[PDB]
Amino acid sequence: VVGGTEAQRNSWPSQISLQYRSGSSWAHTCGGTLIRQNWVMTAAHCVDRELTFRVVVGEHNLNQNDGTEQYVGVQKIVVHPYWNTDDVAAGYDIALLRLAQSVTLNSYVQLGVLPRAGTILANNSPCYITGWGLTRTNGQLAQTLQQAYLPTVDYAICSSSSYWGSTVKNSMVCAGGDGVRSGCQGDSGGPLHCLVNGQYAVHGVTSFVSRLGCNVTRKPTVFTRVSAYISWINNVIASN
């Protein structure tokens, strides 16, 4: 997260760190959202490869003991069948991970509320992105969970040629684009929390940014639109 600040510990209890086993230890690669006691929602491009994954819930500091963490294996990876590794702009960048064990919920670990199927936010709706990603283009990971205010850019604006053009699809949510705040490497798979009728819900799964950099004006961060996959999600859950 570029342009952000360190989140407080109870603001985003649904955020998790996705990590792969690397030799002796593990390595943060992506974000994700806890949506059931034993299911996490992330981006397909994060789990495209055959590696050993775990999610950390109640994580705040990647390399210090917060006293609140549960380190949970991923047993099952379910990618959207139409995901195409080589065409992220086609969409379907979503995946669900069934955890080896169920986590225990507390003030630091909660399920993320998803929107009703088909929900489309009005333009410039207030949202926050969160994660441990780079704090500047080509920088280093944030050790502590970061948040940035990142309001939505509606499809009509985001798909105009000055923005993302035909690269954006209606199955996505764009946010930010002001050249100061955005998602960045290590944030993908994580949530976009958007404030509607007083309560937060995870409207996006961080997917992509410009090749020119993270906080590029008129290149807002692009998220898979969760509300377009609600029936797919529920049926993955119900069938496994």
């Binding site: 992220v88 993908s188 798979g189 997917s207 940014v209």
Partner: peptide
């Protein structure tokens, strides 16, 4: 897909 934000 880099390293992952996916780069678009």
């Amino acid at each position: 897909v880099x390293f992952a934000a996916a780069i678009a």
